[PDB]
Amino acid sequence: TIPHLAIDPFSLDFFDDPYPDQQTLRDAGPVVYLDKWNVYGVARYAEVHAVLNDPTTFCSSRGVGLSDFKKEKPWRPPSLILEADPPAHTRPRAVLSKVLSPATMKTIRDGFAAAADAKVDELLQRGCIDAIADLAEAYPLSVFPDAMGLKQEGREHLLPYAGLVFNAFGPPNELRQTAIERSAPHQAYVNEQCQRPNLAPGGFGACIHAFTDTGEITPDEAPLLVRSLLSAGLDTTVNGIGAAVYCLARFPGELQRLRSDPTLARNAFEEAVRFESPVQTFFRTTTREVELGGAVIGEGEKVLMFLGSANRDPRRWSDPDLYDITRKTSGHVGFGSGVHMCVGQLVARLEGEVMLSALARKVAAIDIDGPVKRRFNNTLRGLESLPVKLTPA
Numbered sequence: 001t002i003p004h005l006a007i008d009p010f011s012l013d014f015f016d017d018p019y020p021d022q023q024t025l026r027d028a029g030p031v032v033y034l035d036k037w038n039v040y041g042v043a044r045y046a047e048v049h050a051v052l053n054d055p056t057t058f059c060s061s062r063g064v065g066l067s068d069f070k071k072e073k074p075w076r077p078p079s080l081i082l083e084a085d086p087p088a089h090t091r092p093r094a095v096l097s098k099v100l101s102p103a104t105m106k107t108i109r110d111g112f113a114a115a116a117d118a119k120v121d122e123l124l125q126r127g128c129i130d131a132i133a134d135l136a137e138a139y140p141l142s143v144f145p146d147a148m149g150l151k152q153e154g155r156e157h158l159l160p161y162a163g164l165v166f167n168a169f170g171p172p173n174e175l176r177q178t179a180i181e182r183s184a185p186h187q188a189y190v191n192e193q194c195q196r197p198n199l200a201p202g203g204f205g206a207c208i209h210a211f212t213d214t215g216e217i218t219p220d221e222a223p224l225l226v227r228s229l230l231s232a233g234l235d236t237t238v239n240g241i242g243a244a245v246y247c248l249a250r251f252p253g254e255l256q257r258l259r260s261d262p263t264l265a266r267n268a269f270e271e272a273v274r275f276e277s278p279v280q281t282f283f284r285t286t287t288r289e290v291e292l293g294g295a296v297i298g299e300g301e302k303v304l305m306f307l308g309s310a311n312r313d314p315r316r317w318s319d320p321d322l323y324d325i326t327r328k329t330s331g332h333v334g335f336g337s338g339v340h341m342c343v344g345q346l347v348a349r350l351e352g353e354v355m356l357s358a359l360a361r362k363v364a365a366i367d368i369d370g371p372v373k374r375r376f377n378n379t380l381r382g383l384e385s386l387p388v389k390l391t392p393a
């Protein structure tokens with residue numbers, strides 16, 4: 001009753017062009033079985049959304065990667081928020097929510113926006129640039145580590161550590177094995193910067209340590225919550241901003257619409273998150289026998305959610321393969337859905353919005369003028385290099 005597919009959604013060929021295989025997954029049925037890794041898969045919007053919104057049945061405390069924490073030791077101490085279920089999840093979530101709250105965005109917006117404008121001005125002086133290294137990477141690196149309160153020394157560890165983290169959610173393939181093999185120096189840096197004395201005052205990190213006296217978290221919980229922001233807060237935005245630039249580069253009609261109304265910047269980034277889904281996948285583990293779209297999944301089974309596929313499901317979206325900066329994007333799962341829905345989505349949108357705003361006001365055309373190279377990662381979708389010529393407005 002449940003179709004079995006040999007598709008490896010973590011192979012390089014899949015990363016190179018996932019969309020045909022994603023339609024195959026959606027159309028095979030609401031619940032598939034991936035023989036390659038012995039996990040269930042859900043690729044339609046309806047089933048992804050249902051699984052995300054039943055944390056009791058599809059839990060996260062046994063890991064949101066392939067590995068089942070009840071069977072294997074996690075490669076690092078479990079995340080106190082990502083890899084926790086209610087009620088243990090509730091109070092750590094509340095703290096990060098306040099640390100990254102609407103009121104906090106107001107304190108950093110002017111600095112984030114100034115840095116966004118300043119980078120686009122700098123890029124326009126060079127003309128031909130790499131929209132990944134020189135923009136998608138350089139901008140988040142110029143605002144986020146500082147907003148965290150990190151010292152200058154050792155920041156080169158941040159992107160490699162993040163790549164390690166997202167590769168580690170994947171199966172024990174060469175991408176994962178090789179990342180873990182090189183991890184030691186990056187883990188040492190990150191763990192050390194999570195200690196209270198190493199986080200500058202007023203930053204995200206210090207604000208986390210400052211919440212240890214409310215009874216929501218204890219002092220020994222703060223370092224791991226800082227580790228969460230250093231895991232999830234940088235590499236995701238690099239791929240989100242790179243996706244937006246890529247879309248604008250591929251769809252000049254939409255760059256022209258954005259230039260004509262720069263207040264479309266925030267939705268243009270949201271549509272970019274739906275269209276490329278930088279975070280492609282996450283796992284859950286069944287805590288009991290469950291019926292999901294006619295399939296009977298037993299207890300203790302891994303369920304792979306195709307977030308990027310759900311965001312392109314024609315059962316949910318009109319013209320899903322078209323980048324539309326005026327699309328009503330509410331409901332996309334690029335940030336997840338439910339109790340675990342990205343707690344840092346206000347930071348991501350702020351970064352994305354003020355960068356697209358700078359582009360909308362300062363750039364007339366974005367033309368690819370070099371070989372595009374993809375960056376392969378078991379969980380993240382994005383580009384290694386995106387040579388573009390920026391024409392000033």
Ligand code: HEM
Binds near residue numbers: 083093241279333345
């Ligand atoms: C384009 C940018 C981003 C994308 C696409 C993204 C994606 C996601 C997704 C899909 C989840 C759900 C995980 C799950 O359901 O198991 C999530 C959770 C999370 N994100 Fe983001 N993220 C982004 C940026 C950020 C930023 C900027 C931060 C912090 C500054 C952050 C921190 C977190 C944390 C801590 C969680 C765990 C929340 C929880 O378990 O309750 N992310 N993110």
Ligand SMILES: O=C(O)c1ccc(F)cc1
Binds near residue numbers: 081083227228232
């Ligand atoms: O360490 C965490 O808590 C975390 C890591 C990755 C991610 F996408 C979200 C949260």
Ligand SMILES: [Cl-]
Binds near residue numbers: 187191
């Ligand atoms: Cl670590």
